[PDB]
């Protein structure tokens, strides 16, 4: 049972006895109140878990692209072989099947490949069909 | 209403509601069969099938004379023959029995588009199959059942198949009898094997006479009460029974619903106060099951692009395929089968398994698509859905079956006919061998080869595989294939087999 | 953005995509493209060597093959070759092996899709290519080498190179290895957890070499017994002394035995207690032998018989239910069992049978049970809906 606080604001508290997987954080008082660029929709999440494609999640991840975007960006900050793995396992499902062009639409990715750069790539890529 | 009726399958006048429909309306009625005589020199069909077909047509022709009409045999393609015929007959209404098969369906779509924008109305019925294949799929959550036992579970909760439609009477035949053009309806006359380019020489009568008349007689004999009451396999059964109905079903010379109820009726009168087990109708239900599975799978008779088929690495091998096709494997059992096949047009289903297995997972490891093609050319009862179906089943390529059951090119044969008289009917260069060695001639002493005037390696070829070493090789390959499919890590082979929808 | 996300992130994502999806993925933008060729995505590869001459499938792209070797020779750790029927295919595999000098492979598999085309190579060409792996891979764990012309000498190179590592060795149907040959492997490789080979190379010396003290505990030993030549060959015999030493040293060992024998070539076979655990009769079995299986195999877990013959096996199935208290899985085709006996059978093991596959024609009805009645009785003792298997009648 301890307590923390985010970059934007000054709000949250949490255990460390039950929260047995507070990892890339188990490093401040291993030597409150010390946390930067993150938020709150990150707490129950790691909390429901960390006592053991499971869903939940499909339920818990059914959020907006922008949020999923940061969930992952926050995911790393504090290692989560489950909750970063899982936000990824997701993004993957979104990708499997698409063309490079469809992946660009459904992620907002602008295409910064000259044209040689891009044609050279589609050439090598057809080698991955048998 | 100048209504044309179109035979493709459903080659009969009993239980032919599409024809009842061509007729109910008055005006003129012509019955036609489009035939492509130069697609007919193409090998996709041997004499036996062609001969079976022309005889069905001739019988139909004959049946129609009894109704003061005739059979119109036009030649070429449906598309760009129906047009020309439309104008020329001022056609009003085209009818035919529905075709569930992918290619057929597509073909028929185009034909009905090309009929709409030309003023002709279309009516189809489905009387080739027991049920509406589409309904069965609807009830199964819009997917076809992919195991027979599930197929049965469902049918058992469903309504019975419609009863056979009564035939049209003469009564309403004259009411639209057409003006047949004398010595010119034989510019619409059923062709001959010679005409379609077939060496007719020392032929002999067909083992399976074609047409509805024959089909209706075989039905009655088949159902003769005490002969029927039988249900242990014979050996006499390997020989073409004169009560077999399979080719008539496939061509539609026999209504499958008729067969269904006559079956019902007789069982009622024998086991009495009772509703029979689905097995009674086993022959009809397997047919439905393959049909149902095939309607919405246009790649149904291929491995690649076929969603229900496991991708197995068969080797292309026209050499081995030929040996199998021609009855030049060393195995009397196998060659006896293939000979009877090519000769008569029918082989018992137990012999189909022996032969199918030898070619696929048992020995040669040749693709099942190739077995399909050979059977398509030789086997009278092999249509698209049923034939691809059995081959996928037998090669353990589809339908979630177990692959450990072996068909021995020697053992299985000796056990289904130890006498050896089957082999001595089709492989007569072996009359002389005693049963003791006839399933395995190469294992007879030369003292016995000679007394039988047959020297293995000369008069009859030597076996082309060591079954044991092949068995062991192929079992392993199946093993691997099913393992990476179940993702089953483990040492048992009954466990590598998924039992429904992939994992 | 998503474009430049991180990159070690994209990798986590990529670990979750098949090859063609990664490839497309890698085309999205400059930053993602740099993820494609990362070593973590290249620990593993299965080469498809096949030819339109001889295969219905597709080969690995030739350009992809060059790129793998040029860029991931030192990332690769798990590699298999699936090779179809043509010589040129087996030759291609060798051409690829011979270039694996910078490889450190943990696992190597050489699979023959169809006709054993490795056997079509000149021996020394094959050996020479394989050798590049034996020599240069110092951490080699598994080796699947079936239908392969490897010889005694090359095994010594193998042993001399990775005897501290070798755990899996699968090598059945390998004609140029003599009993004297394998012995060196069993002997020197103390870590050998599992081994599959032809019966002909199975010897008391081998079993003892494997029961030894220096040796780790075997988890898996698979034997093939094949009637490889004339209409009735006479197999050699292992001393029960060897089998007994063998379970003693490795008491949870699985002993899988597949038999492809004819009429009683079985004489040397079920004559005393064996630690056999998994059985397949891929050819045919005798009632008498099956009886001796009952009397002999208190460790049977799975038993599959593809055919037997004539006499109803009522008592053989009953005895096996009796003496194999570990029987979980059973399959039978092309034989006979009375319905009554079969029911008596399932009553005994029953809850214990995870798998029970019987072809329909096997059952014989009696005064007590009809074919239509047994699926109900069998289902009750199994605890699941169950039916005999059927075959289409077309």
């Amino acid at each position: 049972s301890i307590k923390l606080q985010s970059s934007d604001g000054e709000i949250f508290e949490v255990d460390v006895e039950i929260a047995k997987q507070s990892v890339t954080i188990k490093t401040m008082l291993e030597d409150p109140v010390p946390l930067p660029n993150v938020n709150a929709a990150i707490l129950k999440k790691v909390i429901q878990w960390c006592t053991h494609i499971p869903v939940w999640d499909q339920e818990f991840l059914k959020v907006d692209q922008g949020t999923l975007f940061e969930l992952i960006l926050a995911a790393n900050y504090l290692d989560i072989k489950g909750l970063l793995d899982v936000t990824c396992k997701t993004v993957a499902n979104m990708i499997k099947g698409k063309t490079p062009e469809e992946i660009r639409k459904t992620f907002n990715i602008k295409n910064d490949f000259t044209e040689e750069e891009e044609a050279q790539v589609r050439k090598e890529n057809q080698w991955c069909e048998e | 209403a100048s209504s044309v009726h179109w035979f493709r399958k459903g080659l009969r006048l009993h239980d032919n509601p599409a024809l009842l429909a061509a007729v109910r309306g008055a005006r003129c009625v012509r019955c036609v069969y489009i035939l492509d005589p130069w697609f007919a020199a193409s090998s996709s069909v041997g004499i036996n099938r062609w001969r079976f077909l022309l005889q069905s047509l001739e019988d139909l022709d004959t049946s129609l004379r009894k109704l003061n009409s005739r059979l119109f045999v036009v030649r070429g393609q449906p598309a760009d023959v129906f047009p020309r015929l439309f104008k020329e007959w001022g056609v009003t209404r085209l009818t035919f029995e529905y075709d569930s098969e992918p290619f057929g369906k597509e073909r028929d779509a185009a034909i009905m588009k090309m009929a709409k924008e030309a003023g002709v109305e279309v009516v189809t019925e489905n009387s080739h199959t027991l049920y509406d294949l589409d309904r069965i799929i609807e009830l199964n959550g819009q997917k076809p059942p992919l195991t027979y036992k599930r197929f049965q579970a469902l049918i058992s909760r469903m309504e019975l198949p419609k009863k056979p439609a009564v035939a049209v009477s003469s009564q309403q035949m004259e009411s639209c009898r057409a003006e047949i053009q004398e010595n010119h309806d034989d510019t619409y006359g059923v062709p001959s094997l010679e005409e379609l380019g077939f060496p007719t020489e020392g032929l002999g009568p067909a083992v399976w006479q074609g047409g509805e008349t024959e089909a209706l007689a075989r039905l009655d004999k088949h159902l003769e009460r005490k002969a029927w009451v039988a249900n242990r396999m014979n050996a006499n059964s390997l020989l073409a029974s004169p009560t077999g109905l399979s080719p008539y079903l496939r061509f539609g010379c026999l209504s499958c619903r008729l067969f269904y109820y006559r079956l019902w009726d007789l069982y009622k009168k024998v086991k009495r106060n009772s509703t029979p087990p689905l097995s009674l109708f086993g022959q009809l239900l397997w047919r439905e099951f393959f049909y149902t599975a095939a309607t919405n799978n246009p790649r149904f008779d291929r491995m690649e692009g076929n969603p229900i088929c496991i991708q197995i690495p068969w080797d292309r091998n026209p050499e081995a395929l030929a040996k199998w096709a021609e009855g030049k494997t060393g195995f009397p059992w196998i060659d006896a089968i293939m000979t009877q096949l090519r000769q008569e047009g029918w082989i018992h289903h137990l012999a189909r398994h022996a032969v199918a297995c030898f070619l696929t997972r048992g020995d040669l490891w040749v693709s099942w698509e190739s077995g399909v093609r050979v059977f398509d050319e030789l086997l009278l009862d092999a249509d698209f859905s049923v034939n691809a179906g059995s081959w996928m089943w037998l090669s353990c390529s589809a339908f979630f079956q177990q692959f450990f059951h072996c068909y021995c090119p020697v053992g299985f044969g000796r056990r289904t006919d130890p006498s050896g008289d089957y082999i001595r009917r089709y492989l007569p260069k072996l009359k002389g061998f005693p049963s003791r060695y006839i399933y395995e001639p190469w294992n007879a002493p030369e003292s016995v080869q000679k007394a039988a005037k047959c020297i293995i390696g000369v008069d009859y070829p030597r076996p082309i595989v060591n079954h044991a070493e092949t068995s062991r090789l192929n079992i392993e390959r199946m093993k691997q294939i099913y393992q990476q499919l179940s993702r089953y890590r483990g040492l048992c082979l009954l466990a590598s087999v998924p039992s429904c929808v992939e994992d | 953005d998503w474009g430049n996300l991180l990159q070690d992130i994209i990798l986590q994502v990529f670990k979750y995509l098949p090859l063609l999806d990664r490839a497309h993925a890698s085309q999205v933008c400059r930053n993602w493209n740099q993820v494609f060729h990362m070593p973590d995505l290249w620990r593993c590869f299965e080469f498809e060597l096949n030819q339109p001459a001889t295969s219905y499938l597709k080969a690995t792209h030739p350009e992809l093959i060059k790129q793998i070797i040029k860029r991931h020779s030192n990332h690769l750790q798990y590699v298999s070759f699936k090779v179809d029927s043509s010589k040129e295919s087996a030759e291609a595999a060798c051409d690829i092996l011979s270039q694996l000098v910078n490889c450190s492979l943990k696992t190597l598999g050489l699979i023959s899709t169809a006709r054993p085309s490795f056997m079509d190579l000149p021996k020394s060409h094959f050996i020479s290519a394989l050798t590049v792996v034996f020599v240069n891979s110092k951490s080699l764990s598994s080796l699947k080498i079936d239908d392969t012309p490897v010889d005694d000498p090359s095994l010594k190179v193998l042993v001399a190179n990775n005897s501290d590592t070798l755990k899996l060795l699968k090598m059945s149907s390998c004609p140029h290895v003599s009993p004297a040959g394998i012995l060196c492997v069993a002997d020197q490789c103390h870590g050998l957890r599992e081994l599959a080979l032809n019966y002909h190379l199975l010897s008391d010396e081998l079993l003892l070499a494997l029961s030894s003290e220096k040796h780790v505990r075997l988890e898996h030993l698979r034997i093939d017994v094949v009637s490889e030549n004339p209409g009735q060959t006479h197999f050699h015999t292992i001393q029960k002394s060897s089998w007994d030493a063998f379970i003693r040293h490795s008491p949870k060992v699985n002993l899988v035995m597949y038999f492809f024998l004819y009429e009683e070539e079985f004489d040397p076979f079920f004559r005393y207690e064996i630690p056999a655990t998994h059985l397949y009769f891929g050819r045919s079995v005798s009632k008498d032998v099956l009886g001796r299986v009952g009397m002999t195999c208190p460790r049977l877990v799975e038993l599959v018989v593809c055919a037997n013959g004539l006499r109803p096996l009522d008592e053989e199935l009953i005895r096996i239910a009796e003496r194999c208290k570990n029987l979980s899985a059973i399959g039978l085709g092309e034989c006979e069992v009375s319905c009554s006996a079969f029911v008596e059978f399932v009553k005994m093991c029953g809850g214990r049978l995870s798998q029970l596959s019987i072809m329909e024609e096997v059952l014989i009805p009696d005064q007590k049970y009809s074919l239509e009645q047994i699926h109900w009785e069998v289902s009750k003792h199994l605890g699941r809906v169950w039916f005999p298997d059927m075959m289409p009648t077309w």
Side-chain angles (χ1 to χ4, degrees), chain C residues 362-381:
Chain C
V362 167
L363 299 167
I364 316 299
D366 38 34
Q367 47 189 123
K368 167 155 279 160
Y369 287 106
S370 43
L371 243 265
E372 225 57 60
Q373 299 181 311
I374 31 78
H375 79 94
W376 300 121
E377 270 297 316
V378 177
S379 297
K380 169 166 48 281
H381 305 298

Side-chain angles (χ1 to χ4, degrees), chain C residues 48-310:
Chain C
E48 301 280 351
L49 304 178
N50 53 65
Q51 296 274 337
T54 204
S55 175
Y56 298 86
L57 303 168
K58 256 49 181 316
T60 302
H61 196 292
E63 289 306 293
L64 194 254
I65 295 175
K66 285 198 249 149
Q67 187 176 66
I68 303 322
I69 292 167
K70 182 177 188 181
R71 305 233 244 160
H72 309 302
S73 57
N74 33 23
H75 309 157
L76 285 175
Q77 292 162 15
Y78 307 97
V79 162
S80 70
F81 289 82
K82 304 246 226 69
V83 164
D84 88 5
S85 279
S86 19
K87 212 223 278 294
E88 292 78 357
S89 282
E91 279 170 350
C94 290
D95 290 346
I96 288 164
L97 287 179
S98 295
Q99 292 183 69
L100 308 184
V101 193
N102 316 311
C103 278
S104 227
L105 294 186
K106 302 175 150 174
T107 280
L108 183 59
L110 301 192
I111 290 71
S112 310
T113 270
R115 287 170 274 171
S117 43
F118 286 111
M119 298 304 200
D120 292 336
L121 302 167
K123 243 193 62 170
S124 71
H125 186 200
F126 175 78
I127 296 301
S128 151
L130 222 210
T131 298
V132 187
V133 155
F134 288 174
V135 164
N136 300 278
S137 289
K138 299 325 224 290
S139 316
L140 188 62
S141 319
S142 315
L143 193 46
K144 322 264 196 51
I145 247 42
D146 286 345
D147 311 288
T148 255
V150 282
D151 50 21
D152 290 13
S154 62
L155 286 184
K156 320 183 87 69
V157 188
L158 170 65
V159 160
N161 269 297
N162 308 94
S163 63
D164 302 348
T165 303
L166 195 60
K167 302 192 168 180
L168 279 273
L169 208 213
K170 284 174 163 65
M171 54 141 59
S172 23
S173 168
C174 290
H176 311 137
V177 179
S178 51
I182 350 175
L183 249 163
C184 202
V185 176
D187 184 341
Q188 288 210 47
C189 307
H190 299 137
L192 203 39
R193 268 131 85 275
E194 55 192 307
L195 163 83
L197 43 78
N198 189 263
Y199 183 63
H200 167 266
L201 308 192
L202 181 73
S203 64
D204 292 294
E205 291 62 36
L206 210 216
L207 259 354
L208 298 172
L210 285 160
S211 298
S212 124
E213 251 258 0
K214 269 168 175 279
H215 215 282
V216 99
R217 204 112 55 182
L218 254 75
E219 296 167 352
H220 184 188
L221 169 69
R222 146 87 108 121
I223 310 295
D224 290 323
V225 192
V226 196
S227 192
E228 296 138 301
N229 319 314
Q232 197 98 338
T233 118
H234 294 94
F235 292 90
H236 74 281
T237 273
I238 295 90
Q239 276 279 288
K240 170 162 165 50
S241 333
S242 292
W243 279 126
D244 301 324
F246 175 76
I247 6 184
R248 271 215 325 272
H249 181 61
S250 289
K252 288 177 176 173
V253 77
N254 286 292
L255 172 57
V256 184
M257 294 203 208
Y258 287 6
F259 290 78
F260 306 79
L261 301 216
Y262 302 10
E263 129 138 6
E264 254 122 330
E265 305 175 288
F266 281 102
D267 275 7
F269 279 113
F270 295 104
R271 295 290 177 190
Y272 52 75
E273 173 148 309
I274 3 162
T277 219
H278 297 260
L279 296 173
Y280 180 47
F281 296 84
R283 231 306 183 66
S284 190
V285 216
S286 170
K287 177 175 169 62
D288 300 294
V289 178
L290 283 167
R292 284 161 35 210
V293 167
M295 293 299 330
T296 253
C297 288
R299 300 184 72 228
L300 246 195
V301 167
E302 181 166 69
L303 159 70
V304 189
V305 162
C306 77
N308 150 291
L310 293 15

